Amino acid sequence: GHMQRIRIIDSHTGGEPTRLVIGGFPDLGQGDMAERRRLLGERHDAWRAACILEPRGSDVLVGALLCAPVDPEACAGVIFFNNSGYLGMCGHGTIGLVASLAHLGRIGPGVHRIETPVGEVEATLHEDGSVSVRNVPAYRYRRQVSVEVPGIGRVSGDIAWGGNWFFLVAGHGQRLAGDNLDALTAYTVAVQQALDDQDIRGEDGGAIDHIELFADDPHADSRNFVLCPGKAYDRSPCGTGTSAKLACLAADGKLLPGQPWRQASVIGSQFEGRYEWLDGQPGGPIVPTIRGRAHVSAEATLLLADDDPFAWGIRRGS
Numbered sequence: 001g002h003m004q005r006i007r008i009i010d011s012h013t014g015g016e017p018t019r020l021v022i023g024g025f026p027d028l029g030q031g032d033m034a035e036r037r038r039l040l041g042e043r044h045d046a047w048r049a050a051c052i053l054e055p056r057g058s059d060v061l062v063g064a065l066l067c068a069p070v071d072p073e074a075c076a077g078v079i080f081f082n083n084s085g086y087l088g089m090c091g092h093g094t095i096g097l098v099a100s101l102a103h104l105g106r107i108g109p110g111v112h113r114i115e116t117p118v119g120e121v122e123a124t125l126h127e128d129g130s131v132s133v134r135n136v137p138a139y140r141y142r143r144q145v146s147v148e149v150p151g152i153g154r155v156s157g158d159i160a161w162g163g164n165w166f167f168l169v170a171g172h173g174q175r176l177a178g179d180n181l182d183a184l185t186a187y188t189v190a191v192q193q194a195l196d197d198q199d200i201r202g203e204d205g206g207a208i209d210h211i212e213l214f215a216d217d218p219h220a221d222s223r224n225f226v227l228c229p230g231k232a233y234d235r236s237p238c239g240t241g242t243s244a245k246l247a248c249l250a251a252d253g254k255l256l257p258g259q260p261w262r263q264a265s266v267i268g269s270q271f272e273g274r275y276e277w278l279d280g281q282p283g284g285p286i287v288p289t290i291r292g293r294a295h296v297s298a299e300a301t302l303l304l305a306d307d308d309p310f311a312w313g314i315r316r317g318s
C-alpha cells in the first residue's frame with residue numbers, strides 16, 4: 001500500500017452531515033483544543049480540504065476531528081470545520097459526534113464531557129439515542145443593529161454568541177421554506193458580506209459569519225434558515241444558532257428558564273432548546289441545552305493517492 005488514509009464515520013442530524021475523523025490527521029500536540037485548531041488551520045489545512053471538499057465531500061459537509069482531551073477525565077476533545085474554514089462549537093456536530101461514538105461502541109447512555117476550541121460542553125446520550133448538548137454560555141452582544149445591505153436595503157438584527165457569532169435578522173419578510181432556498185441564500189449572503197465589508201464584528205472582533213432568519217411554524221415554536229460561514233445552509237436548526245436565539249429570547253422575556261422551545265429548520269428537522277442562567281445569575285448569559293437526534297449514515301476510509309491532483313480536494317478560486 002501507499003495511499004494515505006483518513007478513517008471516518010459519517011452521520012447526519014436532521015439532514016445536516018457531520019464527518020467525524022477518528023484517525024489519519026497529523027498530530028496536533030498536547031495543547032488545548034483552541035491551540036490544536038490553530039495548528040490544524042495553519043500547518044495542516046490540506047487535511048480539512050481533502051476531508052470535506054469534492055470529490056470526497058461537498059460544500060454542505062461539516063467535519064469534526066476527534067482529539068484526546070487535555071483533561072484525562074473528559075470524554076473527548078473535538079475541532080469542527082466546514083468548506084471555508086473552522087468553527088467554534090457545533091451543535092448538530094456534537095450530537096453527530098456522540099451518536100457516532102455510541103455507534104462505535106465507545107460510549108453508552110450517560111453524561112459525556114467534550115472539550116472544544118471555545119470551551120467544554122456536556123453531552124448527554126439518552127436511552128432513546130437522542131443527544132442533549134449543554135453548550136457553552138450564550139449571550140446577546142448588541143441589539144437591534146441596523147445595517148445598509150446592498151440589494152436589500154436597511155436590515156436590523158441582534159448580534160449574539162452561541163458557540164459561533166450569529167446575526168439574527170429581525171423582520172426579514174422572507175418565506176422560510178424548503179422550496180425557497182436560492183432566495184434565502186442570496187439574501188443572507190448579502191447580509192453576511194455587508195457585515196464583513198462594513199467591519200461589523202462580534203465583541204472579540206470575530207467575524208459574524210453565521211446569519212439566521214426566524215419565523216413562526218405551525219408545528220413548532222419557530223422555524224429558521226441558517227447561512228453558514230462557507231455560504232452553505234444548515235439542514236438542521238443549528239445548535240449554536242438556536243443557542244444564540246435562546247439567549248435573545250431570554251433577554252427579552254420571551255422564554256423562561258427550564259421552559260422548552262421547539263426549533264424547526266428550513267427543511268423540517270427539529271431541535272428542542274432549553275436554558276438556565278450561567279451560575280443561576282438572572283439577566284446575564286445563559287447556559288443553553290439543545291436536544292436532537294443523529295443517524296450514522298456511513299463508515300469509510302478516504303484514500304489520498306500520491307499522484308491524485310485532488311488528493312487535497314478541489315479547492316476553487318476566489
